[PDB]
A paper describes a structure:
The RGD (Arg-Gly-Asp)-binding integrins αvβ6 and αvβ8 are clinically validated cancer and fibrosis targets of considerable therapeutic importance. The highly homologous integrins αvβ6 and αvβ8 bind to latent transforming growth factor-β1 and β3 (L-TGF-β1 and L-TGF-β3) leading to release of active TGF-β1 and -β31–3. Here, we describe a method for computationally designing hyperstable RGD-containing miniproteins that are highly selective for a single RGD integrin heterodimer and conformational state, and use this strategy to design inhibitors of αvβ6 and αvβ8 with high selectivity. We found small α/β ferredoxin folds were able to scaffold the RGDLXX(L/I) binding loop without clashing with the integrin while making additional contacts with both α and β subunit (α- and β-loop respectively).
To investigate the accuracy of our designed structures, we used single-particle cryoelectron microscopy (cryoEM) to determine structures of human αvβ6 ectodomain bound to B6_BP_dslf and human αvβ8 ectodomain bound to B8_BP_dslf. Using focused refinement, the nominal overall resolution is 3.4 Å for the αvβ6 - B6_BP_dslf complex and 2.9 Å for the αvβ8 - B8_BP_dslf complex, although the resolution varies considerably due to the intrinsic flexibility of both integrins. Despite extensive 3D classification of the αvβ6 - B6_BP_dslf complex, we did not observe any subclasses of the integrin-minibinder complex in a closed headpiece conformation. The secondary structural elements of the designed B6_BP_dslf minibinder model are in close agreement with the cryoEM map (complex RMSD 0.6 Å vs design) and the three minibinder loops make contact with the alpha, the beta, or both subunits of integrin, although some interactions vary slightly from the initial design. In the cryoEM map, the overall orientation of the minibinder is shifted relative to initial design, but the RGD loop positioning is as predicted. The engineered positively charged, affinity-enhancing point mutation in B6_BP_dslf, A41K (A39K in B6_BP), interacts with negatively charged E316 of the β2 subunit to form a salt bridge. Although the second charge reversal mutation (G64R in B6_BP, G66R in B6_BP_dslf) does not form the anticipated salt bridge with D148 in our structure, we note that this binding surface has a strong negative charge and speculate that this stabilizes the positively charged Arg. As predicted, we observe hydrophobic packing of LXX(L/I) L16 with Y185 of the β6 subunit. Of the 13 interacting pairs of residues present in the cryoEM model, 11 are present in the computational design model, including all three salt bridges.
Residue numbers in the entry:
A (entry chain B): 113 to 354
B (entry chain A): 1 to 440
C (entry chain C): 3 to 74
Amino acid sequence: DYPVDLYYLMDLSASMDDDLNTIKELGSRLSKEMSKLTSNFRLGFGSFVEKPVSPFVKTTPEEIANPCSSIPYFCLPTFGFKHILPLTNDAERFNEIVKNQKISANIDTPEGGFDAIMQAAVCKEKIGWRNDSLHLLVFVSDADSHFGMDSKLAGIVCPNDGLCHLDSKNEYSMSTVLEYPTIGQLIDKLVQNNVLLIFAVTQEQVHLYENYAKLIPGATVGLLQKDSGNILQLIISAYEEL
Amino acid sequence: FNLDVDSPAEYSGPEGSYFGFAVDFFVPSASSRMFLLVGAPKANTTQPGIVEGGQVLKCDWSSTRRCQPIEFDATGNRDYAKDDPLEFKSHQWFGASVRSKQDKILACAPLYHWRTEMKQEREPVGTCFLQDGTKTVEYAPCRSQDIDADGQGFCQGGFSIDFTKADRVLLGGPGSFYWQGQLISDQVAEIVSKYDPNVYSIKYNNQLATRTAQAIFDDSYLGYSVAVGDFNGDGIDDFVSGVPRAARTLGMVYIYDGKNMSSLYNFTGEQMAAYFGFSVAATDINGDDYADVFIGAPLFMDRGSDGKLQEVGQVSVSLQRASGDFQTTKLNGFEVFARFGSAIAPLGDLDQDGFNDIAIAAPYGGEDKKGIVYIFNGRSTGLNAVPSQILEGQWAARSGCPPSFGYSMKGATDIDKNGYPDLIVGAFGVDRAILYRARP
Amino acid sequence: CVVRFVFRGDLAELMLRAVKDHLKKEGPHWNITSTNNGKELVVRGIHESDAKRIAKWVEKRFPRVHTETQCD
Ligand SMILES: *[C@@H]1O[C@H](CO)[C@@H](O[C@@H]2O[C@H](CO)[C@@H](O[C@@H]3O[C@H](CO[C@H]4O[C@H](CO)[C@@H](O)[C@H](O)[C@@H]4O)[C@@H](O)[C@H](O)[C@@H]3O)[C@H](O)[C@H]2NC(C)=O)[C@H](O)[C@H]1NC(C)=O
Ligand SMILES: *[C@@H]1O[C@H](CO)[C@@H](O)[C@H](O)[C@H]1NC(C)=O
Ligand SMILES: *[C@@H]1O[C@H](CO)[C@@H](O)[C@H](O)[C@H]1NC(C)=O
Ligand SMILES: [Ca+2]
Ligand SMILES: [Ca+2]
Ligand SMILES: [Ca+2]
Ligand SMILES: [Ca+2]
Ligand SMILES: [Mn+2]
Ligand SMILES: [Mn+2]
Ligand SMILES: [Mn+2]
């Protein structure tokens, strides 16, 4: 009866508007099924969008206030990464949080998913990863991501340090200061943090993440389906250990 | 192997200005004195109403070692209408890129924002200033009616610049067309002769440029970095341009015809997210009279002795042969996360041995991530894989960006007139620029 | 005739959705298909009438959207 700590990381960009309803279903289905693996089960939650910096985001005050402006449509302001729920035993709290997530937006196709992975894996003190448990990080998105050096276009030339930078609002305070992390850096820290990374993406986006998974040890991929249980199967088989 | 690293000429700017972010040499006509051109994109300057607008300073080699701002622009922001600014120069990073041809100085602001005439928008179109002798004009090839993300609205023209031998300005604008990227090439005579201070959008009739394509090419960043040289034997410098996110983050580099902008050659990386195409360079490295192609891939992960992947950086070298074919070899970095290949700069025939030599930087290597620059020799067989000389950064790291010695550099100019080309290496994290002389 | 609307960027889904809803209202009996996994919307079975309206409506209201029209 070995403990399992599950962290669910949701992409809230505009491109997720078509996906979000199925992501919420995956979240609650996961919570229910995880209860079948062990009594020592806990799960947390966080989310990400993009660096709120030109040219990734428009700087006119109307659009800053509402990045979906002139569609017309209302959505949340752009932010990098937020930590919402320290992993807990309160499965009901998890579901209530996931159900109330809302759309945010940015301009370009790739997202800030790599900043979010780095902080979620690194900030042990705020996420609550146990010393003796499986550490599972589920990454949900429908797009590719930015990585180190891509931020040069935004005027950001200070390399990611791989350190935890979450303030009193649980926001990534260095979002607009440091470069997106590189894969070599994500691997270094995911291994040090003993975290297994799962990439749940849509069909067109699967091959690309499969290629990344071949570089990142312990990483797996799957398809984000309405029949989302196909992802849970990765989590379940990962529990056998032996 | 012949750089004087013991007593270099060290120049400095205002703190926080990123002095040394970009460098070049200035060589004015006739028996004039040589000067160094050092960018400082976050310099506060004295421009009314503008904060951290950026500037370029002319630094004197002959004596004294003081630097003075070049008066490209000494005004505040122009208005479109009463209490409605036309342009936003604050934080434009002017001086982030500087190039010079003879007595012509080209400097740009990649983060310059402009108000589209049509509506009260603010888009990062980019802008350049070209000083030709005593006349300075504004050049803005991405400032037009082709607005928004699908157009040139997010071009950031001036992100990368160079000059051709045949009197043309080469400009990259990586954000064009939803980040497909665009290359633009214009005549220097045309840029100045068509200039009017009250015209914001100027059409250049002899302009060459790439065009927008299918969405499959979005997020590729063509024009991220550029270089020039003859790759088809027509006597006309052709265009070399990196495309770092092409082929699903595998990365590509394109070569276009210098006369009609038609694609001639393509290079592809070997590893996803190695950022192949981050930087490019062109030079004849083996003395075969044909330009060779140097492509960086700073995030490349190699396979260590323990089977573990590790990020070291990679540079590929493609030798041009008379048949049109290329012979490609590869050089890997020496330190993990040093990002070898971040900056590549031909040095010309540094040691006067008949072959051009070249420097490759690794800005985050060395103790305390001070930054390392490697010097490699050329030979009739290609590039010698082992470096002959290593330059170490000498400054303590500060908060934020590390000194990043080797971040940017330029050579192939004999500043002290001793027969050997010299080298300028920037270290913007500590607001510094360093001149290294080449010894006999 | 066929009209192909290509949406780009993070807002592509919201723009396509808005356009798609408009098209359903303007032409509820048209064959309207989502292609390229939600990045492109294609309308076919039309006859050089809507081409003068829907293609223009999208360009006017959403200038950033690319439109390609084909007829036989
Ligand atoms: C280096 O890689 C580049 C990128 O892949 C190569 O450039 C592309 O090469 C393809 C194949 O030749 C070209 O595709 C052609 O498209 C025309 C139709 O063009 C017109 O219609 C399209 C819309 O369908 C529109 O977007 C265009 O602007 C035109 O109005 C076809 O008739 C041809 O048969 C063929 O399919 C691409 O256009 C071309 N450019 C780009 C950006 O994709 C390049 O050739 C490679 N170079 C080397 C040396 O390998
Ligand atoms: C530029 O001036 C402003 C206003 O005094 C100041 O806040 C900013 O820190 C200065 N930037 C520098 C010295 O880089
Ligand atoms: C460009 O010029 C070369 C040499 O004259 C010619 O072979 C080629 O077809 C031209 N391409 C275009 C698009 O004009
Ligand atoms: Ca040529
Ligand atoms: Ca050669
Ligand atoms: Ca030599
Ligand atoms: Ca010299
Ligand atoms: Mn998105
Ligand atoms: Mn989606
Ligand atoms: Mn994006």
